[PDB]
Amino acid sequence: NDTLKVMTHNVYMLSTNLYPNWGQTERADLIGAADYIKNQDVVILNEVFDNSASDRLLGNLKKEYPNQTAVLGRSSGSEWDKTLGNYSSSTPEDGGVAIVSKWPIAEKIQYVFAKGCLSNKGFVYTKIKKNDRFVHVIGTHLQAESPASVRTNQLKEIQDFIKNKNIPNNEYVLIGGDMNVNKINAENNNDSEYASMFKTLNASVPSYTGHTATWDATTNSIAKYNFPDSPAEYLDYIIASKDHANPSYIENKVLQPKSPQWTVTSWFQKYTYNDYSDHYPVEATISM
Numbered sequence: 001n002d003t004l005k006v007m008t009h010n011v012y013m014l015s016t017n018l019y020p021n022w023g024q025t026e027r028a029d030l031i032g033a034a035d036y037i038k039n040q041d042v043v044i045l046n047e048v049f050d051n052s053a054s055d056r057l058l059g060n061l062k063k064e065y066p067n068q069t070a071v072l073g074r075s076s077g078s079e080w081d082k083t084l085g086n087y088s089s090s091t092p093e094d095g096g097v098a099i100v101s102k103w104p105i106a107e108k109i110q111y112v113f114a115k116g117c118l119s120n121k122g123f124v125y126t127k128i129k130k131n132d133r134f135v136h137v138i139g140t141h142l143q144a145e146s147p148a149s150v151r152t153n154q155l156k157e158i159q160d161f162i163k164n165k166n167i168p169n170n171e172y173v174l175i176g177g178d179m180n181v182n183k184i185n186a187e188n189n190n191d192s193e194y195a196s197m198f199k200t201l202n203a204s205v206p207s208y209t210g211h212t213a214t215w216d217a218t219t220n221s222i223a224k225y226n227f228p229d230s231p232a233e234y235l236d237y238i239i240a241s242k243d244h245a246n247p248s249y250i251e252n253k254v255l256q257p258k259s260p261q262w263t264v265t266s267w268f269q270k271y272t273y274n275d276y277s278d279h280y281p282v283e284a285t286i287s288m
């Protein structure tokens with residue numbers, strides 16, 4: 001049809017070598033079988049750092065999304081058409097970004113950001129063939145909270161890459177992921193980092209629906225454990241480049257899916273959670 005469904009989710013899968021008891025393996029199975037992640041055309045994943053759990057998750061998503069990229073910054077072989085940027089094979093961790101789709105992926109490129117405040121952070125570019133139409137999806141995860149200066153530099157690298165690619169102006173180019181750029185209380189400030197994000201990427205502002213935050217310690221069990229008193233934030237987006245096909249309609253809906261209860265043990269203490277990640281997923285609907 002004339003609709004494209006793209007979802008982005010920071011799944012919080014830290015390395016089990018550093019955090020052995022964060023339920024990474026179990027959550028890989030829970031997310032893989034979750035209803036919220038079904039029925040999409042493309043899914044962008046962030047923080048799939050743990051090697052075993054990330055591969056398990058990707059394997060669980062294979063049935064519905066058999067076309068998959070490797071995980072950003074974990075390798076630099078022929079699994080990528082090109083490895084761009086400051087890639088280092090000596091980093092202690094990878095970039096944690098991967099893209100999966102139910103449609104054939106014509107091109108897969110990884111790009112490692114030049115600056116940061118040890119993990120090959122950057123973005124993954126994919127050219128996807130959806131029903132005789134090529135769409136372009138870039139998945140990324142920016143510098144977490146000077147950081148603003150770094151994020152702007154990273155966003156500039158993304159825009160520069162898109163421009164250099166010479167992608168047809170009549171094809172859709174989406175940029176999605178955890179931007180770590182907070183929208184809350186910044187929509188009216190034209191000099192805010194939030195406003196600057198769209199200008200740096202030369203992207204449009206999508207219609208917002210669903211929950212009012214993507215990282216919410218007031219409703220998310222994992223975020224509550226880590227930062228119980230931190231105000232909710234809006235950091236995840238999926239937006240379209242204005243230098244290419246401009247969607248007549250593009251929506252970003254924040255979902256609040258709860259997972260079956262899972263338990264972990266740490267320091268002789270048992271902890272139970274009902275969230276898939278500390279971030280909520282964003283479901284984008286783009287009219288083509």
Ligand SMILES: [Ca+2]
Nearest residue numbers: 010012047278
């Ligand atoms: Ca995080």
Ligand SMILES: [Ca+2]
Nearest residue numbers: 049050051094
């Ligand atoms: Ca890893």
